[PDB]
Amino acid sequence: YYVDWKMLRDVKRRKMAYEYADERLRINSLRKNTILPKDLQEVADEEIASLPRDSCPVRIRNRCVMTSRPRGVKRRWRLSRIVFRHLADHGQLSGVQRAMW
Amino acid sequence: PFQNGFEEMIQWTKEGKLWEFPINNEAGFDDDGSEFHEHIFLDKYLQDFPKQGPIRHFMELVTCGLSKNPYLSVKQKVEHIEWFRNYFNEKRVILKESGIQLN
Amino acid sequence: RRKALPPRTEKMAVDQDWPSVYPVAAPFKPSA
Amino acid sequence: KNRAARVRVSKGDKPVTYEEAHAPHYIAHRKGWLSLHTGNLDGEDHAAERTVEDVFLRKFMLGTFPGCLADQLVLKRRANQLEICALVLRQLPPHKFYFLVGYSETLLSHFYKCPVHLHLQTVPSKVVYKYI
Amino acid sequence: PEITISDEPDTLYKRLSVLVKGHDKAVLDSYEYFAVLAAKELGISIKVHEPPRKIERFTLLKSVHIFKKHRVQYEMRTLYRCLELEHLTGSTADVYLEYIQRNLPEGVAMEVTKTKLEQLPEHIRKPIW
Amino acid sequence: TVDFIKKQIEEFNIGKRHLANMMGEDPETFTQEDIDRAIAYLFPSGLFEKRARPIMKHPEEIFPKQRAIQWGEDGRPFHFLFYTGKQSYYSLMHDTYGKLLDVEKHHNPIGSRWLIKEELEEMLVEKLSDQDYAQFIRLLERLSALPCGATEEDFVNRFRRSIPXXXXXXXXXXXXXXXXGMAFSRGEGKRKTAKAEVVVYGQGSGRIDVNGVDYLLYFPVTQDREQLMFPLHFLDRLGKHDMTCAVSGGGRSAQAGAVRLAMARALCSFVTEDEVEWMRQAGLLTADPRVRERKKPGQEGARRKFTWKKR
RNA sequence: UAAUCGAUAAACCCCGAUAGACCUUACCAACCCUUGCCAAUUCAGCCUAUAUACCGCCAUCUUCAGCAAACCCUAAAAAGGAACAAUAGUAAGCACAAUCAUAGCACAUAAAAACGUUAGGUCAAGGUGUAGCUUAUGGGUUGGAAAGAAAUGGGCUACA
Ligand SMILES: [Mg+2]
Ligand SMILES: [Mg+2]
Ligand SMILES: [Mg+2]
Ligand SMILES: [Mg+2]
Ligand SMILES: [Mg+2]
Ligand SMILES: [Mg+2]
Ligand SMILES: [Mg+2]
Ligand SMILES: [Mg+2]
Ligand SMILES: [Mg+2]
Ligand SMILES: [Mg+2]
Ligand SMILES: [Mg+2]
Ligand SMILES: [Mg+2]
Ligand SMILES: [Mg+2]
Ligand SMILES: [Mg+2]
Ligand SMILES: [Mg+2]
Ligand SMILES: [Mg+2]
Ligand SMILES: [Mg+2]
Ligand SMILES: [Mg+2]
Ligand SMILES: [Mg+2]
Ligand SMILES: [Mg+2]
Ligand SMILES: [Mg+2]
Ligand SMILES: [Mg+2]
Ligand SMILES: [Mg+2]
Ligand SMILES: [Mg+2]
Ligand SMILES: [Mg+2]
Ligand SMILES: [Mg+2]
Numbered sequence: 012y013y014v015d016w017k018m019l020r021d022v023k024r025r026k027m028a029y030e031y032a033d034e035r036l037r038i039n040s041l042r043k044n045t046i047l048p049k050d051l052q053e054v055a056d057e058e059i060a061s062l063p064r065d066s067c068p069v070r071i072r073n074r075c076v077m078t079s080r081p082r083g084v085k086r087r088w089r090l091s092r093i094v095f096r097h098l099a100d101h102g103q104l105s106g107v108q109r110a111m112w
Numbered sequence: 113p114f115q116n117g118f119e120e121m122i123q124w125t126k127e128g129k130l131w132e133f134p135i136n137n138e139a140g141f142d143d144d145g146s147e148f149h150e151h152i153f154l155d156k157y158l159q160d161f162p163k164q165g166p167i168r169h170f171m172e173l174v175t176c177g178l179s180k181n182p183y184l185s186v187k188q189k190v191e192h193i194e195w196f197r198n199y200f201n202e203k204r205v206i207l208k209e210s211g212i213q214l215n
Numbered sequence: 216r217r218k219a220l221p222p223r224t225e226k227m228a229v230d231q232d233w234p235s236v237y238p239v240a241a242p243f244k245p246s247a
Numbered sequence: 248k249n250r251a252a253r254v255r256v257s258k259g260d261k262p263v264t265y266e267e268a269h270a271p272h273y274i275a276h277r278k279g280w281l282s283l284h285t286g287n288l289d290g291e292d293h294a295a296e297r298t299v300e301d302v303f304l305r306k307f308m309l310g311t312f313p314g315c316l317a318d319q320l321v322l323k324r325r326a327n328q329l330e331i332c333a334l335v336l337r338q339l340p341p342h343k344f345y346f347l348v349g350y351s352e353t354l355l356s357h358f359y360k361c362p363v364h365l366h367l368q369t370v371p372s373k374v375v376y377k378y379i
Numbered sequence: 380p381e382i383t384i385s386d387e388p389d390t391l392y393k394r395l396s397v398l399v400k401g402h403d404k405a406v407l408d409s410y411e412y413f414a415v416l417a418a419k420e421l422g423i424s425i426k427v428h429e430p431p432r433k434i435e436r437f438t439l440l441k442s443v444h445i446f447k448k449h450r451v452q453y454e455m456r457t458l459y460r461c462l463e464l465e466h467l468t469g470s471t472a473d474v475y476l477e478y479i480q481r482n483l484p485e486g487v488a489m490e491v492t493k494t495k496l497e498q499l500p501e502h503i504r505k506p507i508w
Numbered sequence: 509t510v511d512f513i514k515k516q517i518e519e520f521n522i523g524k525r526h527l528a529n530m531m532g533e534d535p536e537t538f539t540q541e542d543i544d545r546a547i548a549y550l551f552p553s554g555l556f557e558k559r560a561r562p563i564m565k566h567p568e569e570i571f572p573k574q575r576a577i578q579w580g581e582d583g584r585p586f587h588f589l590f591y592t593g594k595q596s597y598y599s600l601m602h603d604t605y606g607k608l609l610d611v612e613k614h615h616n617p618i619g620s621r622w623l624i625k626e627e628l629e630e631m632l633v634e635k636l637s638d639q640d641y642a643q644f645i646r647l648l649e650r651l652s653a654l655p656c657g658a659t660e661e662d663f664v665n666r667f668r669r670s671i672p673x674x675x676x677x678x679x680x681x682x683x684x685x686x687x688x689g690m691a692f693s694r695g696e697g698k699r700k701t702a703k704a705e706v707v708v709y710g711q712g713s714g715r716i717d718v719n720g721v722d723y724l725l726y727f728p729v730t731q732d733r734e735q736l737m738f739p740l741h742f743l744d745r746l747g748k749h750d751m752t753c754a755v756s757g758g759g760r761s762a763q764a765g766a767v768r769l770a771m772a773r774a775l776c777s778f779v780t781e782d783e784v785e786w787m788r789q790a791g792l793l794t795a796d797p798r799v800r801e802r803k804k805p806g807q808e809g810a811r812r813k814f815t816w817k818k819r
Numbered sequence: 820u821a822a823u824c825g826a827u828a829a830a831c832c833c834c835g836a837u838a839g840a841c842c843u844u845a846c847c848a849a850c851c852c853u854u855g856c857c858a859a860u861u862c863a864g865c866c867u868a869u870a871u872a873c874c875g876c877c878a879u880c881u882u883c884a885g886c887a888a889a890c891c892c893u894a895a896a897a898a899g900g901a902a903c904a905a906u907a908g909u910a911a912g913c914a915c916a917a918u919c920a921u922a923g924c925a926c927a928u929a930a931a932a933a934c935g936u937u938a939g940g941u942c943a944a945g946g947u948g949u950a951g952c953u954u955a956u957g958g959g960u961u962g963g964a965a966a967g968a969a970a971u972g973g974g975c976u977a978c979a
Contacts, residue, residue: 556919
């Protein structure tokens with residue numbers, strides 16, 4: 012079990028987004044070009060609009076991997092602030108010390 | 113049985129479980145036995161295409177893109193190009209209709 | 216049935232060469 | 248009042264491990280780090296993986312070795328191999344201890360796809376740093 | 380132990396630059412000692428220095444719910460030692476570095492740069508097209 | 509607890525040998541100095557608190573002193589003051605007072621201080637009270653107050669300590685350059701993100717060069733040039749000396765001040781030993797401890813706070 | 820408005836968010852699916868009701884000096900227990916202090932700051948006791964929200 016249903020949803024959006032990556036890339040290339048004819052670009056427009064939009068990149072949300080919390084995650088540890096702190100304060104996180112200066 | 117720790121590590125490494133030393137981070141990845149001119153120089157795959165058209169503009173761009181791309185094998189770079197051949201060749205109609213004659 | 220065996224430090228020869236004892240990367244056993 | 252990873256003052260009779268008696272602000276001053284790996288240094292990658300990994304090995308060792316675990320479990324990562332040190336209390340008859348040694352090493356090695364090394368240091372009773 | 384000798388003219392290194400990143404300054408001190416003592420025995424002619432320490436700090440909230448007046452801050456320090464070796468052979472480097480890396484402690488990382496000596500490529504020597 | 513001290517000192521020596529033989533030194537001339545280096549290299553703990561770093565030491569420095577057995581196996585106590593609960597203190601007191609009495613029948617600023625309270629507490633292996641300490645020291649003043657015999661002086665010497673005091677601005681010997689055969693002095697000031705180095709040549713045209721350009725051009729702010737003028741106008745040397753300068757970090761005033769410090773430092777080779785104490789009391793050679801204060805989180809300016817609301 | 824929740828004297832009000840176009844999302848509107856993530860389970864799954872059942876993390880008095888076992892005394896003890904030319908107090912522990920960090924001093928700042936107090940904050944970080952939901956308070960797809968008569972908190976930019 013992933014910890015939440017929200018997680019299942021986003022796991023799947025990751026798998027989707029890896030699936031169609033190159034269709035996206037390829038099609039969008041024409042679409043982003045000023046050298047090509049506009050005519051090509053309209054059809055291609057309809058084409059990326061075609062492919063399932065649960066497979067689009069921006070629809071992805073980094074979460075805390077243990078705790079699932081949608082905000083507060085620190086990119087490097089893929090952890091929520093609460094969980095991160097929790098670990099770092101038993102000393103279980105290497106090289107992280109409470110900062111004084 | 114293991115007579116010593118050195119013995120241990122030794123058997124691990126012959127086995128492939130330990131790493132080789134000193135480390136080269138490319139160990140275990142041969143990249144198909146390809147060489148630099150099979151990445152950088154993409155003339156091979158542009159042979160079928162209109163040579164004076166904006167199609168050349170575009171595909172010279174894609175060329176430059178895939179020439180600079182470390183994260184892909186030769187087989188994938190190829191696949192991109194062939195996908196563009198297939199794509200442009202699939203729409204002859206739109207090529208003709210935009211004010212340029214395209215092959 | 217409870218087992219207490221004295222540490223290797225008890226049988227240790229005062230001049231015994233060290234790298235014999237600790238050849239490679241080790242956890243630091245307090246016993247040995 | 249900071250409640251973080253702290254152990255409250257009792258009527259004064261409560262036994263305390265050296266680690267659990269030294270509060271979060273003390274890390275790197277008196278207390279050390281429970282884990283070691285490259286991942287948090289300036290130029291380094293995959294810190295997250297070693298964190299998930301670490302967490303799972305905490306839970307795993309707590310569950311494979313019931314009631315016999317002494318103090319929090321000390322992980323080291325060296326050149327792709329894990330060195331897992333444990334302070335373990337003496338409860339089990341030694342056969343069972345070696346059963347679980349082999350069991351753990353094998354199982355983990357095949358899970359994390361890297362060679363694991365296990366070390367048990369056995370202790371008569373939980374070390375008491377304070378009170379008691 | 381098995382040694383072989385192949386006819387081919389082994390690689391020269393002008394300068395072998397070895398950086399060790401770490402957390403604890405102690406570990407990097409003792410490791411310097413070890414590296415210098417290994418190098419002194421292998422006739423390697425080395426120097427060592429201490430590059431400026433990096434300290435990366437960042438900030439989290441101090442509570443679960445809401446007091447944003449209240450934060451905690453955390454640090455990671457990254458300390459450096461660099462062993463700069465001069466005039467090494469190919470094999471010399473391979474062995475010395477093998478001995479170094481094998482004994483690398485768990486808290487530290489190592490970043491190697493070799494500067495290799497090659498005379499001139501073949502098509503450039505003195506042909507002109 | 510004494511059995512522990514016997515055992516521990518034995519094992520300490522056995523482990524001492526064991527240390528020398530692995531570390532590969534002669535077990536004879538092995539010192540604590542060597543012990544430290546040894547462990548420090550074997551168990552390298554980066555840790556800030558230095559007591560929590562690994563130690564192998566003679567148990568006497570490790571363990572606290574103990575109060576010895578205070579009574580025979582009959583129950584009967586050795587010292588007659590035992591029932592005072594502080595014998596250690598009141599023995600010193602009885603003796604001190606006795607010394608005094610004998611002195612009265614007989615009689616018909618070196619940097620020396622009395623012990624701290626902690627040092628008398630160490631000397632008697634006894635917890636003390638402030639009042640008690642004070643009482644005693646008071647008594648030692650009474651002792652010093654009279655004619656001082658030989659054993660009298662020894663007695664008070666037990667409770668004597670001596671302290672160092674050192675004040676001089678450290679004087680660099682000059683340096684005569686080989687090229688012109690001329691003497692120079694090279695100073696380094698540091699102020700507030702800005703370090704400067706100033707080489708001062710003893711025979712000048714008045715020339716002052718900064719980072720390869722002239723000082724007027726590098727300090728268009730008049731104030732700065734005044735700051736620069738300070739040491740030289742102080743020592744009346746204004747035209748006499750020729751300075752080369754390299755400064756980096758921070759903004760203009762910080763720079764001018766760094767040059768102030770560096771210069772005033774490089775100017776004490778060419779000055780008299782007396783003018784030095786003047787430059788100190790002018791405050792020229794003392795660094796500026798003043799620096800930016802870190803913002804604090806949940807605040808504004810390290811001091812400035814977010815506007816506070818009563819309602 | 821068909822259309823979230825939580826905070827809301829000092830100790831809310833650029834607050835959970837170091838962050839909502841879809842997503843996030845918990846909301847409303849329609850449609851749909853019923854061992855419906857997992858190795859097995861008359862079992863799953865629930866941002867549903869309890870923060871006045873809680874653990875976690877914190878706020879607050881607070882840069883406040885006290886808290887507390889083990890004892891000892893008081894022509895009785897609810898409780899109290901010091902005077903230093905000392906009159907019944909001794910006591911390890913936790914606080915403060917001390918040391919650490921801000922790369923040498925020093926000061927400064929940072930940190931720390933017990934016991935309790937406010938049934939202070941949070942069952943929407945996560946986890947749980949008690950209760951409820953189970954062809955639905957569960958799970959999905961598609962759209963839709965976040966309009967200003969004002970009233971006010973904090974900011975930014977000005978008035979030269
Ligand atoms: Mg997003
Ligand atoms: Mg606070
Ligand atoms: Mg300001
Ligand atoms: Mg409310
Ligand atoms: Mg409420
Ligand atoms: Mg409130
Ligand atoms: Mg605010
Ligand atoms: Mg939405
Ligand atoms: Mg719901
Ligand atoms: Mg209610
Ligand atoms: Mg409450
Ligand atoms: Mg609570
Ligand atoms: Mg007090
Ligand atoms: Mg009382
Ligand atoms: Mg210091
Ligand atoms: Mg201070
Ligand atoms: Mg504070
Ligand atoms: Mg303090
Ligand atoms: Mg309430
Ligand atoms: Mg309230
Ligand atoms: Mg819940
Ligand atoms: Mg429950
Ligand atoms: Mg629904
Ligand atoms: Mg929606
Ligand atoms: Mg108004
Ligand atoms: Mg303003």
